[PDB]
Short mmCIF file of N, CA and C in Angstrom, two decimals:
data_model
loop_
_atom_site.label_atom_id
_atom_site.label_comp_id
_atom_site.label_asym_id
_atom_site.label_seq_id
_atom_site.Cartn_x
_atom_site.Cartn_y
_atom_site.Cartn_z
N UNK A 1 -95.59 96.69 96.97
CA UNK A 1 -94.47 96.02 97.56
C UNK A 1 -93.29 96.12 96.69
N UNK A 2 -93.55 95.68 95.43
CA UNK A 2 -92.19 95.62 94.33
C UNK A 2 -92.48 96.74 93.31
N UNK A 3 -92.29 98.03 93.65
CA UNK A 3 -92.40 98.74 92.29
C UNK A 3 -91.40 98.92 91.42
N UNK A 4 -91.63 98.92 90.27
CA UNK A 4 -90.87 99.05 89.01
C UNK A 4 -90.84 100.23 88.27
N UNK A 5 -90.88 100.81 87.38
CA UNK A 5 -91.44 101.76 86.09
C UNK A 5 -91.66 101.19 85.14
N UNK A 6 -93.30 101.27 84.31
CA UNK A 6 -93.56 100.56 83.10
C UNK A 6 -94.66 102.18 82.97
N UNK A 7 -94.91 101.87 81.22
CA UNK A 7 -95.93 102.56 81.01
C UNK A 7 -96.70 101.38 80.01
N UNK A 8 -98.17 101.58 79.66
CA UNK A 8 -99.44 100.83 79.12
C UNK A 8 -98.58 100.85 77.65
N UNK A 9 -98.60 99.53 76.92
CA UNK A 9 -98.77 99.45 75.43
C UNK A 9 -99.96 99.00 74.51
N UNK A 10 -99.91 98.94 73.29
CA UNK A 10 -100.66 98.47 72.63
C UNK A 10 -101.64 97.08 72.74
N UNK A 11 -102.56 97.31 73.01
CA UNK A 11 -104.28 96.02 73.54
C UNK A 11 -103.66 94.88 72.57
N UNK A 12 -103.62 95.39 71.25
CA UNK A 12 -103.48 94.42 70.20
C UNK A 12 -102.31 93.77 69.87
N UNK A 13 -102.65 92.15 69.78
CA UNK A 13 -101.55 90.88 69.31
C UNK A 13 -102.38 90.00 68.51
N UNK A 14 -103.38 90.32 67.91
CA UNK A 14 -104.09 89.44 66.83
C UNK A 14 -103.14 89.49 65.31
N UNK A 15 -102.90 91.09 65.23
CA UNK A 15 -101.58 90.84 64.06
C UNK A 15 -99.87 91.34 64.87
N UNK A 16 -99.81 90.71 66.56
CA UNK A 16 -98.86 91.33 66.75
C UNK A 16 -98.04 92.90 66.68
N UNK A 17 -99.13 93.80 66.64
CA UNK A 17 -98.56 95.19 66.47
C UNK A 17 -98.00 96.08 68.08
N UNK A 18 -97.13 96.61 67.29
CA UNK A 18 -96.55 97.13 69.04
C UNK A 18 -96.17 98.48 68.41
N UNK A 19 -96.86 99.42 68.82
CA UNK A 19 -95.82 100.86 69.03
C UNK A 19 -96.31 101.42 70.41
N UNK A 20 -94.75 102.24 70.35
CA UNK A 20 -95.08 103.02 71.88
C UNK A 20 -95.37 104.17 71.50
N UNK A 21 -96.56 104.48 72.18
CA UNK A 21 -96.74 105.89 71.96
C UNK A 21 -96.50 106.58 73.55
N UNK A 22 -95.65 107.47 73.77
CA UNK A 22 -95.03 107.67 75.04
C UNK A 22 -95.62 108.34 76.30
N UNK A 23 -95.55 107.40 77.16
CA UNK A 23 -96.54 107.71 78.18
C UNK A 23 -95.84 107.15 79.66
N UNK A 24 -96.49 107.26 80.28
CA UNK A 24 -95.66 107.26 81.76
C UNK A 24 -96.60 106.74 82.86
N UNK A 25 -96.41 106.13 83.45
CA UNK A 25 -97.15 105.12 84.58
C UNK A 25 -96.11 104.74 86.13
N UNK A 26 -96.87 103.76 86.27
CA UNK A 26 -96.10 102.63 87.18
C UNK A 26 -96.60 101.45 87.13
N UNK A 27 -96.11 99.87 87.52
CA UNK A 27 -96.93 98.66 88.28
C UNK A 27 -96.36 98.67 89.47
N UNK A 28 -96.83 98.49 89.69
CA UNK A 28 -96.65 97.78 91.33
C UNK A 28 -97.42 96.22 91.45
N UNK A 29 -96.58 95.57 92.21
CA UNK A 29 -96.74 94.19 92.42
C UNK A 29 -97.36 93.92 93.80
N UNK A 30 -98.51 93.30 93.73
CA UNK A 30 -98.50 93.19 95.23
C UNK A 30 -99.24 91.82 95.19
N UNK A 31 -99.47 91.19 96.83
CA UNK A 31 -99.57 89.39 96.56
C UNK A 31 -101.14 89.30 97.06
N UNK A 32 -101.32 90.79 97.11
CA UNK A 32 -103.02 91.16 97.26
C UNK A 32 -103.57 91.03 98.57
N UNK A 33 -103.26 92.40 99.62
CA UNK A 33 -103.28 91.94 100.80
C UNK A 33 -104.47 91.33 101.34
N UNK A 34 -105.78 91.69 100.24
CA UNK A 34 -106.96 90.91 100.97
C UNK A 34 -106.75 89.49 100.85
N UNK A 35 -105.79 88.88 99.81
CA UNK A 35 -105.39 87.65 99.83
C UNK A 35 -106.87 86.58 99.47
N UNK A 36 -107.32 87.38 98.46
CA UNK A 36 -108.49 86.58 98.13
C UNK A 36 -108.81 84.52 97.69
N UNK A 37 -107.23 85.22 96.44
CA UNK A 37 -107.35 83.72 96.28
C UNK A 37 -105.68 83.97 95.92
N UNK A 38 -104.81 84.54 96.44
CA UNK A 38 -103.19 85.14 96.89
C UNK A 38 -103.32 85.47 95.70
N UNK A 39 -103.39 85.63 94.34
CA UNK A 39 -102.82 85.26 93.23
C UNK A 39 -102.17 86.76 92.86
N UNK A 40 -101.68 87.00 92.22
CA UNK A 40 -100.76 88.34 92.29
C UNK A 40 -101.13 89.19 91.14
N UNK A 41 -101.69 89.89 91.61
CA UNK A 41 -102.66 91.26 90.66
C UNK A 41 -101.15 92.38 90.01
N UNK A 42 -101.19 92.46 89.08
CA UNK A 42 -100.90 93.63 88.70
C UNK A 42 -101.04 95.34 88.49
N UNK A 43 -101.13 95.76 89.28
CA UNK A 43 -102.15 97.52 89.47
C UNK A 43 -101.51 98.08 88.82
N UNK A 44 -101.55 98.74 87.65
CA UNK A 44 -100.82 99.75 86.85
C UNK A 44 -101.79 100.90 87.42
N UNK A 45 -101.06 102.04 87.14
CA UNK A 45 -101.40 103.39 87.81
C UNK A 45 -101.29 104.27 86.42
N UNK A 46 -101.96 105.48 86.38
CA UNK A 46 -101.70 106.32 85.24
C UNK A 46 -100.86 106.82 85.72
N UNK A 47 -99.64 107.83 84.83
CA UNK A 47 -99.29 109.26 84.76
C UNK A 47 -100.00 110.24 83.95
N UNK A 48 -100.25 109.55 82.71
CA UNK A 48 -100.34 110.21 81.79
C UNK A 48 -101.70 109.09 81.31
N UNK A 49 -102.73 109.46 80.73
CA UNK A 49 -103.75 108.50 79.95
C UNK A 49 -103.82 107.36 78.90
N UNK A 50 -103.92 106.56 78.85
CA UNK A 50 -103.93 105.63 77.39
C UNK A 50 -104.60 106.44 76.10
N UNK A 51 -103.66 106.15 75.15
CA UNK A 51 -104.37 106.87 74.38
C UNK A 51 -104.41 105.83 72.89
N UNK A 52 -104.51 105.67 72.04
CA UNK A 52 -104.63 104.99 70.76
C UNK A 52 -104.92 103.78 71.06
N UNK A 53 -105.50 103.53 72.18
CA UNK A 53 -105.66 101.53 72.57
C UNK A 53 -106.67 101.85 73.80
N UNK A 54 -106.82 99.90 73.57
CA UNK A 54 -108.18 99.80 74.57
C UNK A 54 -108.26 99.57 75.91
N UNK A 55 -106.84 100.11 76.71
CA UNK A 55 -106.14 99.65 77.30
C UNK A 55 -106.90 100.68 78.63
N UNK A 56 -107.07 100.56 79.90
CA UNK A 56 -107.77 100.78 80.61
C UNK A 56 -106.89 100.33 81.65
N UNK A 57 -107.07 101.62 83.23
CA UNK A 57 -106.29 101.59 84.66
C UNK A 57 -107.00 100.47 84.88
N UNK A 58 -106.71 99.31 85.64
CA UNK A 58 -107.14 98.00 86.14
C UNK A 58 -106.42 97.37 86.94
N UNK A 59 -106.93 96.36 88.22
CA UNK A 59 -106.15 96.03 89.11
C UNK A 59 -106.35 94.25 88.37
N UNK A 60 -105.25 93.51 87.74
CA UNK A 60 -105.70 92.57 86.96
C UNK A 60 -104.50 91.07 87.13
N UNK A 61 -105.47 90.46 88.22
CA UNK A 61 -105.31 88.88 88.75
C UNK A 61 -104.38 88.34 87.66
N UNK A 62 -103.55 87.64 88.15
CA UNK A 62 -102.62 86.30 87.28
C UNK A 62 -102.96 85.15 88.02
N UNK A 63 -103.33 84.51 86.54
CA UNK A 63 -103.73 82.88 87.12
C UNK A 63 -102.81 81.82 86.90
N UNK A 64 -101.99 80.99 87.41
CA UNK A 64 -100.85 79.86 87.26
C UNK A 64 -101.34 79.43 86.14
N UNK A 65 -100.67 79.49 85.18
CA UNK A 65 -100.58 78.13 84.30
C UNK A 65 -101.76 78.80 82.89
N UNK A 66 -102.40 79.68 82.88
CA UNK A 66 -103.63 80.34 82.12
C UNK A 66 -102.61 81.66 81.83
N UNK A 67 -101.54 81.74 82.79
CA UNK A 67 -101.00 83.21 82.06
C UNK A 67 -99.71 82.87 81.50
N UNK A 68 -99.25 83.16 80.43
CA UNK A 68 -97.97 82.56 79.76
C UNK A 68 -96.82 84.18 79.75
N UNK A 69 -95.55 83.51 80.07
CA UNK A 69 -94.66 84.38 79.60
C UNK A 69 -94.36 84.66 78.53
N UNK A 70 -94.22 85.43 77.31
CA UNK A 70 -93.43 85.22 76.22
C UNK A 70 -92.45 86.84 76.39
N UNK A 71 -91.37 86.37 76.23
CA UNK A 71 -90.28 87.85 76.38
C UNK A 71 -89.95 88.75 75.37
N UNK A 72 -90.47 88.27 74.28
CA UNK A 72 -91.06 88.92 73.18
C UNK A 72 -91.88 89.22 72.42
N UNK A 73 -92.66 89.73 71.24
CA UNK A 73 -94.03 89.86 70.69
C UNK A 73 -93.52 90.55 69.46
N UNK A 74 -93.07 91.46 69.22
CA UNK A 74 -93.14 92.11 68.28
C UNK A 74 -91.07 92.29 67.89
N UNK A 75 -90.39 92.09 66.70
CA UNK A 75 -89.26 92.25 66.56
C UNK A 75 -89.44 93.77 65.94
N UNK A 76 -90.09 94.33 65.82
CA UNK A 76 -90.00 95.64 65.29
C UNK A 76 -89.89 96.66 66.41
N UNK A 77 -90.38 96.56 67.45
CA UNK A 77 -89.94 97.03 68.70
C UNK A 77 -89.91 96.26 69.96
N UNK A 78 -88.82 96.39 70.80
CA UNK A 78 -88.55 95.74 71.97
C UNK A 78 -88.90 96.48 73.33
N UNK A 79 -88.19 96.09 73.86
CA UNK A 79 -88.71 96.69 75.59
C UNK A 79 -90.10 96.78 75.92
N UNK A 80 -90.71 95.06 75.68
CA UNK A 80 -92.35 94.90 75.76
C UNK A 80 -92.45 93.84 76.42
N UNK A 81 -93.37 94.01 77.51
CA UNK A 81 -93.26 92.83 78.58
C UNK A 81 -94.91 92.27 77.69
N UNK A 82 -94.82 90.86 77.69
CA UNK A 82 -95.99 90.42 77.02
C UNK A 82 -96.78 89.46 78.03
N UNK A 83 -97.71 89.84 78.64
CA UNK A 83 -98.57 89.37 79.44
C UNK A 83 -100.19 88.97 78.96
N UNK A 84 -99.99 87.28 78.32
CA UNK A 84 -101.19 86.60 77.76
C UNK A 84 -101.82 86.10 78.44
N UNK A 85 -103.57 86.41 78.65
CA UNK A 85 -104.20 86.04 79.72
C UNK A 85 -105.45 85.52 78.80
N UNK A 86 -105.52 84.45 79.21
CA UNK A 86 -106.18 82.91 78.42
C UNK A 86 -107.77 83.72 79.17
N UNK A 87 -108.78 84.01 78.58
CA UNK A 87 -110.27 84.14 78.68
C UNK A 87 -110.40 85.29 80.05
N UNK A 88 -109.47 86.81 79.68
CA UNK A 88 -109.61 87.09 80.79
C UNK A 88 -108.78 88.62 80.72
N UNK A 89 -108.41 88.79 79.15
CA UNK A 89 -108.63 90.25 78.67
C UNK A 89 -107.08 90.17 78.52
N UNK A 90 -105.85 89.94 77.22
CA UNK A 90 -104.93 90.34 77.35
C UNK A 90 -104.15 92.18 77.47
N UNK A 91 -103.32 91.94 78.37
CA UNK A 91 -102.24 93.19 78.42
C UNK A 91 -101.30 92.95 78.69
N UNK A 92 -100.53 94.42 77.37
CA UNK A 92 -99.11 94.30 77.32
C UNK A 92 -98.69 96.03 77.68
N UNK A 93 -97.06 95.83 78.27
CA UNK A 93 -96.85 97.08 79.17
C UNK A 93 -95.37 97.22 78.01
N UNK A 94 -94.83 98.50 78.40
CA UNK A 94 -93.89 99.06 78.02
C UNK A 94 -93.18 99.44 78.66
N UNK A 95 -91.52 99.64 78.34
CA UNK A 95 -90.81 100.29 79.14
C UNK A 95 -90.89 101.21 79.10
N UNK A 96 -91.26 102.63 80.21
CA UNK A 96 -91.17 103.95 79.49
C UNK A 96 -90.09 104.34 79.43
N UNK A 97 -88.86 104.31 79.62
CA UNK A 97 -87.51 104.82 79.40
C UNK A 97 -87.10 104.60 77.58
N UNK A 98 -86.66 105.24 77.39
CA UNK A 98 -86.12 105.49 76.24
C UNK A 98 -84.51 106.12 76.40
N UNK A 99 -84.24 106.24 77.52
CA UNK A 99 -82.36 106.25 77.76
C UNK A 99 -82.17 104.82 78.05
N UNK A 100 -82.64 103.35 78.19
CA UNK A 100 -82.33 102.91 78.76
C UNK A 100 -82.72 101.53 77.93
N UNK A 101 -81.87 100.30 78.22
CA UNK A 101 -82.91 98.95 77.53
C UNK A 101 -82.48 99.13 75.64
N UNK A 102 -81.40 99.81 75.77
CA UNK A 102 -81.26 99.56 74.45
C UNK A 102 -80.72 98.70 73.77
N UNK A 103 -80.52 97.71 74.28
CA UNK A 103 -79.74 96.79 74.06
C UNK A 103 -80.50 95.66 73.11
N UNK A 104 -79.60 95.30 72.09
CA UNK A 104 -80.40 94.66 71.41
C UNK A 104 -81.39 93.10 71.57
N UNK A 105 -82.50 92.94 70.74
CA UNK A 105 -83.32 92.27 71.18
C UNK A 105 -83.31 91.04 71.64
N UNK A 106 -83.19 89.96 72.67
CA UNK A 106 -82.93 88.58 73.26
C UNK A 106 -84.01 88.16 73.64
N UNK A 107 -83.90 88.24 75.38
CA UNK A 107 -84.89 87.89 75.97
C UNK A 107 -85.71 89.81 76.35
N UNK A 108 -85.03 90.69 75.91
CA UNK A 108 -85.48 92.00 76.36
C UNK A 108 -86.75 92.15 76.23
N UNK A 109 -87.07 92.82 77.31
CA UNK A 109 -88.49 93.07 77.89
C UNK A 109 -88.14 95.17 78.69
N UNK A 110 -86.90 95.45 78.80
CA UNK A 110 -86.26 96.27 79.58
C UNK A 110 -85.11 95.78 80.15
N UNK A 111 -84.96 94.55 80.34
CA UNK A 111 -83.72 93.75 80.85
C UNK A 111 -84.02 92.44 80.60
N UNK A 112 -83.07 91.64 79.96
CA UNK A 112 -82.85 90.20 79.80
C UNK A 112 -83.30 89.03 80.68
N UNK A 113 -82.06 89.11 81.51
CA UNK A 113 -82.10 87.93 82.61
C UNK A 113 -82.86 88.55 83.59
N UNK A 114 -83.02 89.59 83.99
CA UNK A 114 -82.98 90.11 85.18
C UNK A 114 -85.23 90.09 85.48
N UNK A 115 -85.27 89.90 84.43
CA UNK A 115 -87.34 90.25 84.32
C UNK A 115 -87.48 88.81 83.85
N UNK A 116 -86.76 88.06 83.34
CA UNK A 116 -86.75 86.32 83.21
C UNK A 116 -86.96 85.63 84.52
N UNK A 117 -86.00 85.96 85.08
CA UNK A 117 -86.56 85.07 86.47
C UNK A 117 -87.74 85.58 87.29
N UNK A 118 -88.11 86.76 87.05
CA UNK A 118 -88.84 87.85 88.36
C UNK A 118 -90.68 87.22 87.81
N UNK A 119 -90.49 87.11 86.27
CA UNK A 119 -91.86 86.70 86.10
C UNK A 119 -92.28 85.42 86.33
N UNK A 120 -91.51 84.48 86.19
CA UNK A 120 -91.62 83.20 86.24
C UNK A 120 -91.91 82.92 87.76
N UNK A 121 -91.26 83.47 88.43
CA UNK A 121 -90.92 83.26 89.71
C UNK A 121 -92.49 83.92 90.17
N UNK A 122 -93.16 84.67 89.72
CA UNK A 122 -94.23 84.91 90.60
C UNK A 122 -95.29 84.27 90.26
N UNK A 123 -95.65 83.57 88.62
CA UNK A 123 -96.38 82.78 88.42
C UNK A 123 -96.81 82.00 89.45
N UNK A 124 -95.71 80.98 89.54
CA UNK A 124 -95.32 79.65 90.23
C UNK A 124 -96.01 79.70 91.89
N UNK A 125 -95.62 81.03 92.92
CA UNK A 125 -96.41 81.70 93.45
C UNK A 125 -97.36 81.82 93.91
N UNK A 126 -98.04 81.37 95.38
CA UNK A 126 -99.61 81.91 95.07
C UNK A 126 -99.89 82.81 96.47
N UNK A 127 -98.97 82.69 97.21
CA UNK A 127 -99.11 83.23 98.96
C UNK A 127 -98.61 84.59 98.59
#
């Protein structure tokens, strides 16, 4: 329904490490048409394979209130969407653009305000 461009980042936030190693994907958002329990799955798609992480194609449920936003993780590199999932396998995505999102670090994830409201807003969400 809502596609974006992201590619897979680094499994690991036990010491917070983030590099991109450059790769190419998609998510797509959808509110899960079997509508199991609505909650809004994230499907990342390959282009290209994961490679240096434990990071695996997966169609992977968000639960209200068990999944936290944070719009940052790592100050050594930005354009990292950080998606913490409380007993239930964390993942974090990347922007794959590298023309783009260069802007220095705030709320950046790939864009500031603009991925601030879009995540919050689907948490909250369950239809």
């Amino acid at each position: 329904v809502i596609k974006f461009r992201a590619g897979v980042c680094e499994y690991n936030e036990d010491s917070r490490l983030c590099t991109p190693i450059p790769v190419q994907g998609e998510i797509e958002i959808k509110p899960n048409e079997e509508e199991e329990l609505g909650f809004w799955d994230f499907e990342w798609r390959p282009t290209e394979k994961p490679v240096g992480r434990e990071l695996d194609p997966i169609s992977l449920i968000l639960i209200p209130g068990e999944t936290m936003w944070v719009p940052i993780k790592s100050s050594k590199s930005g354009r990292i969407f950080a998606l913490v999932f409380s007993s239930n396998e964390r993942y974090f995505f990347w922007l794959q653009e590298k023309n783009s999102g260069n802007l220095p670090l705030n709320e950046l994830s790939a864009k500031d305000k603009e991925i601030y409201n879009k995540m919050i807003g689907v948490l909250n969400n369950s239809s």
